Swiss-Prot record, chain A:
Molecular function in Gene Ontology: angiotensin type II receptor activity; receptor antagonist activity
Gene Ontology biological-process entries: angiotensin-mediated vasodilation involved in regulation of systemic arterial blood pressure; blood vessel remodeling; brain development; brain renin-angiotensin system; cell surface receptor signaling pathway; exploration behavior; G protein-coupled receptor signaling pathway; G protein-coupled receptor signaling pathway coupled to cGMP nucleotide second messenger
Coiled coil regions in record: none
Gene from which this protein is expressed: AGTR2
Effect on the protein of changing residue 280 to A/Q: Abolished angiotensin II-binding
UniProt comment concerning the protein's domains: Helix VIII may act as a gatekeeper for either suppression or activation of the receptor, depending on post-translational modifications and interactions with various receptor partners. Helix VIII is found in a non-canonical position, stabilizing the active-like state, but at the same time preventing the recruitment of G-proteins or beta-arrestins. Upon switching to a membrane-bound conformation, helix VIII can support the recruitment of G proteins and beta-arrestins.
Entire protein: shown range: 35 to 334 of 363
Positions of disulphide bridges: 111-355, 189-260
Tissues expressing the protein: In adult, highly expressed in myometrium with lower levels in adrenal gland and fallopian tube. Expressed in the cerebellum. Very highly expressed in fetal kidney and intestine.
Name under which the protein is recorded: Type-2 angiotensin II receptor
Organism annotation: Homo sapiens
Binding site for angiotensin II: 175-176, 247, 269, 280, 344, 362
Region (Helix VIII): 389-398
Cell compartment(s), UniProt: Cell membrane
Amino acid sequence: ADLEDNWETLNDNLKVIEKADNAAQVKDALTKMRAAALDAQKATPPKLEDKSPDSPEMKDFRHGFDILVGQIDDALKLANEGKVKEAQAAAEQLKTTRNAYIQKYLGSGSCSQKPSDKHLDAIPILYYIIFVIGFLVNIVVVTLFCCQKVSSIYIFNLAVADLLLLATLPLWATYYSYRYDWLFGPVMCKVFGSFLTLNMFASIFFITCMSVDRYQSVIYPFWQASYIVPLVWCMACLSSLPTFYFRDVRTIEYLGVNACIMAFPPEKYAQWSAGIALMKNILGFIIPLIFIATCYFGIRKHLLKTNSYGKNRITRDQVLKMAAAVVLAFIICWLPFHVLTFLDALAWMGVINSCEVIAVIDLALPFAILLGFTNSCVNPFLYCFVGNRFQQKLRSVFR
Amino acid sequence: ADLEDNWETLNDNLKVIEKADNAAQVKDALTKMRAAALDAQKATPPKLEDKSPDSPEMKDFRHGFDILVGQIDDALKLANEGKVKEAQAAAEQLKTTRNAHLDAIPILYYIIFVIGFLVNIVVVTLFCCQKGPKKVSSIYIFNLAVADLLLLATLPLWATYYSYRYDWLFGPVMCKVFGSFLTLNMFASIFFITCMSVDRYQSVIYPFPWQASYIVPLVWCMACLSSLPTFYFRDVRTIEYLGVNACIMAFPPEKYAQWSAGIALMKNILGFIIPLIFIATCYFGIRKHLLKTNSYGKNRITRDQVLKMAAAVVLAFIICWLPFHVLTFLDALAWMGVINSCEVIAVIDLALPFAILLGFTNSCVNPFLYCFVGNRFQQKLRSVFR
Ligand SMILES: CCc1nc2ccc(N(Cc3ccccc3)C(=O)c3cccs3)cc2c(=O)n1Cc1ccc(-c2ccccc2-c2nn[nH]n2)cc1
Ligand SMILES: CCc1nc2ccc(N(Cc3ccccc3)C(=O)c3cccs3)cc2c(=O)n1Cc1ccc(-c2ccccc2-c2nn[nH]n2)cc1
């Protein structure tokens, strides 16, 4: 009798029609669907719950099922006439009506405000400011090898991953400016969508390599790079496959705009939205932060286990300052984004059903995304512009 | 006691050191290797069998094992001190020790230079004074022609460098500059070839302005970043056994075999594997959309000619670049210690200057394959769409 369970009854029986052999299978499935459609029409969605029945958005909700039951009756007509392929063709029009629901009541469509209502002129400006500043500081990192170590190889790969990540900012600023109207074709929606995720993870995984490398340099003062570097680009490539698979241009009917969305299976759209959001947290923040934090306290342990003289005290704390800066910068730049992503996942799970909260997440998200790119501006100062001085202060305490 | 069986004993124990947990495993393996190295030093190879022991090539053979036993003793020193990762690092230098002119080539290089330069001259000059800066696909054509033109412009250098039996007479600064200029325009060519296949595919699957202002700089940016490890490692170094100053890939000598194997894999993945994935997927992507549309009359002749133009861009790229990357992958396996037979290593050396020429020959194919024959692809794609 629940709305979510009735859509499951509608989508499971819609699959039966596609793989049906005889007209009796189609008729049976459509009879179950007509019952579920009328039962779902009586239900009230979790979003716009405390809403009057005479309201236009509640009258539109029940109207959607009048269209749906009408399409079911046209397919039932054909099934009873013994017209299987005709009924299966008529039943395929139910998907168009089902998609008009998932982009309205299932999501923050008929909940949170439209992009036109939440458009700030500062966002495209801020995105170009971080683009030119971040692009020029990573140009220094790369050209610094020309005018002048296994660790240096990870620096270059980090600078390349950062420099290609920041190179996508002119696209998102343009896409935001045209109120989410993708004017580059659906092919570049998959390609640059994947290219973004590829270099984002390549940045985060090479940050993780640096902490493991600096830790292994502290605990053990004393071919690995020629296999770890291709492997880091391999894992970033595999982590960016769900982006290539689901990113696609789809027309948002109530906005009349072609948006580069995450075109998930409509029959399990909330499940996928919640699932992929958890993948972002675990794979992009939780797991790399476990490594970065463990390597910090791992280094912090060994420096409090060597010597405590006054001359070697200054040298010890400056190594710890460089060590605490790589963990704090990663948290400040990526924690706001993953907090909003975890809250977003709870909204798809049905935990958060407040449009006030969901609206906060929507307007905060373009800013939280910018801090993620801002981490690529910080990396030159954390690793390249310190690596030359971190090495001599680590050899001083070791002697 | 056989030389082949002693090298098998040396290679099997190297696999033990890599996967060793404790210093005793490393010490045990190196003790078996020191025995196998001294036993192999006493053996005479099948080649240069009927050769005097006082001969320089016989003294060099036994000298190679004196270097090999030396590195084993340096590793045994660390293993006995309880330095596992240090001993495993020292034992990896044993691989470097284990791995240890045609007049037609400079002529052929100048033939491809003048033919390729003149075919890209007709394309560059066409776009400016006899056409215009309109259309999006035409912008990639011009950038491809510029990248090809500048790539073919380096052929007089490699022909001269080959003529002086690899004696770089231009200074170590131009070894880094033209070395990177070569790689820059090589990747700029391959990446704009990749753009063309993605553009033609997007024109087929979606028959219905901004994208060009962003992609052209992004492609040249990725070309500059791909040619940086070239600028950092290419340098002039004296090759003692040839007595010549060669413009080589000056990797750290203590870590030369790992770097040579690593950068060879970079060439295959970034310069052939990844771009070929795009070119092949866009071909079968186009091939899919045309075959699902039922053609049978005049439209069938129109459909197959579009497929002929489509199959020509993937086949030309494979014919011109696959020989080079096959030899590069085999070269990488030789540095990894996979390929031990010097006969196939000698084949790579003489087959490499020819395989490099086919790479430049792809820049002779691109003007015909996209600007000239590719102009009909525009008219014949709108005919099947209508
Ligand atoms: C800082 C890096 C970053 N830049 C972005 C730039 C733009 C946008 N936006 C929204 C936007 C548009 C214009 C201005 C401002 C915002 C988009 O619409 C598009 C994204 C990809 C193609 S279009 C989102 C992001 C954005 O979420 N991130 C972070 C991030 C987190 C997680 C994943 C991820 C991990 C695992 C599996 C799948 C994904 C996954 N998420 N979205 N696609 N793929 C990818 C990226
Ligand atoms: C067709 C394009 C091409 N022209 C070349 C012209 C000459 C030579 N040769 C050998 C030679 C000399 C004289 C006559 C004939 C051959 C050289 O000694 C020099 C090369 C660069 C400065 S000197 C090699 C090549 C050659 O390998 N290639 C292909 C190629 C493949 C891969 C990379 C590459 C990718 C990623 C990272 C690094 C590199 C990288 N390899 N060498 N430096 N940088 C660059 C180029």
